[PDB]
């Protein structure tokens, strides 16, 4: 890796500088280098990793959607350029999935980190599914579901129902069901069950945790209103 000769601590420092400079491709490359050192990530570090790649893939997804919209309205140039952006998006998703499989998920030292990474795996397969077709899409969808489901199983056993990571996983898994897997019934059931089981415990939470949890509950609610 291009970052193999740089100290782990220097890579983390430069990731934070890149964030300040809004250089998210650099930030992602620095965080990739830090992951490839082979050590576990702290909570702050895996948030840096997530933010960096979300900004990168988010820009590619938005560009892909612009180009796909022009293509659908409509020579080969629009399709060609959409395919170029698509291939770059797939490359970034493959890179993130590679970090998670080699070896962030298996090395995660606590349930919260494990769930965080398995959710991320589901998310990046989901981003692949948005642009995939045919048999590849079907394989990708099954991979996304399996990752999300493993995260669900762990979060149910190890995390309280108001935990923000558990809630965020349920949010994204239910979006997967509705938007990708054409399973609106599963999306609604998952969001509803998650919402109810969190609501039961809101009174046990501090002021800040209550705000955190109801924030994501409202995200579940917005999706339920769209869906129901």
């Amino acid at each position: 890796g291009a970052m193999g000769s740089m100290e782990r601590a220097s890579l983390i420092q430069k990731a934070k500088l890149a964030e300040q400079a809004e250089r998210y491709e650099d930030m992602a490359a620095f965080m990739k280098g830090a992951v490839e050192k082979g050590e576990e990530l702290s909570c702050e570090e895996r948030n840096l990793l997530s933010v960096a790649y979300k900004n990168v893939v988010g820009g590619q997804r938005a560009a892909w959607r612009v180009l796909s919209s022009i293509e659908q309205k409509s020579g080969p140039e629009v399709r060609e350029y959409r395919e170029k952006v698509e291939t770059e998006l797939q490359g970034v998703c493959d890179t993130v999935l590679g970090l998670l499989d080699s070896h962030l998920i298996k090395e995660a030292g606590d349930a919260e980190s494990r769930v965080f990474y398995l959710k991320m795996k589901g998310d990046y397969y989901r981003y692949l599914a948005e642009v995939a077709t045919g048999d590849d899409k079907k394989r990708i969808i099954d991979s996304a579901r399996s990752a999300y489901q493993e995260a669900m199983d762990i979060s149910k056993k190890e995390m309280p129902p108001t935990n923000p990571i558990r809630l965020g996983l349920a949010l994204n898994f239910s979006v997967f069901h509705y938007e990708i897997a054409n399973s609106p019934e599963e999306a609604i059931s998952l969001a509803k069950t998650t919402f109810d089981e969190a609501m039961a415990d809101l009174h046990t939470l501090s002021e800040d945790s209550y705000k955190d949890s109801t924030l994501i509950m409202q995200l579940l609610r917005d999706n339920l209103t769209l869906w129901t």
Binding site: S50, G168, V175, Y178, L219, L226
Partner: peptide
Amino acid sequence: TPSLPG
């Protein structure tokens, strides 16, 4: 449908 914003 929107996903988690972070």
